[PDB]
Amino acid sequence: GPDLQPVTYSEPAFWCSIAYYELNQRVGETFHASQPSLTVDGFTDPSNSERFCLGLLSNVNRNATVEMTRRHIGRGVRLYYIGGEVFAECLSDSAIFVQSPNCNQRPATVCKIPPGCNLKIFNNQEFAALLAQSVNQGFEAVYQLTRMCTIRMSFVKGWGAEYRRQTVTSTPCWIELHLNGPLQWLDKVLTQM
């Protein structure tokens, strides 16, 4: 057996996974989205396939700054896609902040979404174009394209160049979104490098 395993692809049961963080620690289980629309909020429903409720997640190493920020998440953010493009809507009373390398390519730019705004955060056509442009740049170049399939968002507090908090590990409440569809296409290119 000098050949490798035949690679097969099955459609993901979830179009994205979301991991919640407080400062630099994972908090709670990873949320998986089986529906085209979902909301990440600060409430306490643990059994809604369309709601990732952060208010019920406990953290015994949590300080008062994180505790106060959690109370301001409120209605949180609505995440849903149309076609090959993903977007985020701020339902909360406080703003939300987004770091999307796929959006920066069009590299740490953090964008505010004021309460009530509807903003786009991903375009799969521009990712495929970049993925096509990256195959010429080597294996390690394409391998680091995972950053384009992941989107980080912070509630209430911002971070980056325009803020005292330099990194996302300094924000009290943030999430990391993984786009499973594009990750599969990236997987097929990586296996062919």
């Binding site: 594009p182 290119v189 062919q192």
Partner: peptide, 22 residues
Amino acid sequence: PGLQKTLEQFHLSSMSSLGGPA
């Protein structure tokens, strides 16, 4: 080769879907 095929499939599917290569 087969890499250019995958790039062309993705270029096509990227226009209207987040679906994978299945």
